[PDB]
Amino acid sequence: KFNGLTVLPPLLTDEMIAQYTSALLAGTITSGWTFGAGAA
Amino acid sequence: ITPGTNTSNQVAVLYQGVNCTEVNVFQTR
Ligand SMILES: *[C@@H]1O[C@H](CO)[C@@H](O)[C@H](O)[C@H]1NC(C)=O
Ligand SMILES: *[C@@H]1O[C@H](CO)[C@@H](O)[C@H](O)[C@H]1NC(C)=O
């Protein structure tokens, strides 16, 4: 702590990561493979 | 830390949530 070591935060918070895994799930469950290749 | 030219000057002081009271002003995570 006296030593000039630091820990920077990630750009995407765990809240934002959980919103992406939610969108990937909701796309997969409602629309199959289609949201990977065009509109859902 | 700083941004560029048209995006003029305005700086970040890179604390681990430790306050801005050491230094518009906006405390940030
Ligand atoms: C400002 O933006 C323009 C956009 O065309 C860019 O050419 C220029 O290099 C930028 N910076 C300065 C100092 O003008
Ligand atoms: C420092 O900031 C925290 C929030 O990040 C706040 O709860 C606390 O009261 C502040 N302390 C001082 C002395 O400004």
Taking the C-alpha atoms of residue B15 and residue B22, their distance in angstroms, rounded to an integer, is 10
Cβ of A6 within 8 Å of Cβ of B16? The answer is yes
| Ligand number nearest to the C-alpha of B23 | 2
Distances (CA, A) of B15 to A2, A19, B1: 14, 26, 11
Q: Structure tokens of B29? A: 């995570």
Q: Structure tokens of B12? A: 């970040």
Q: Structure tokens of A36? A: 């990977």
Q: Structure tokens of B6? A: 């048209």
Approach to solving = cryo-EM
Backbone angles phi, psi at A11, to 5 degrees: -70, -50
- Which residues on A lie below 8 Å from B14 (Cβ)? 6, 8
User: Resolution in A, one decimal?
Assistant: 3.2
Taking the C-alpha atoms of residue B29 and residue B21, their distance in angstroms, rounded to an integer, is 15
User: How close does chain A come to B9, measured CA to CA in Å?
Assistant: 21
Exposed, middle or buried, B28 (CB in 10 Å: 0-12/13-18/19+)?
exposed
DSSP assignment of A1-40 equals --SS---PPPSS-HHHHHHHHHHHHHHHHHHTTGGGTS--
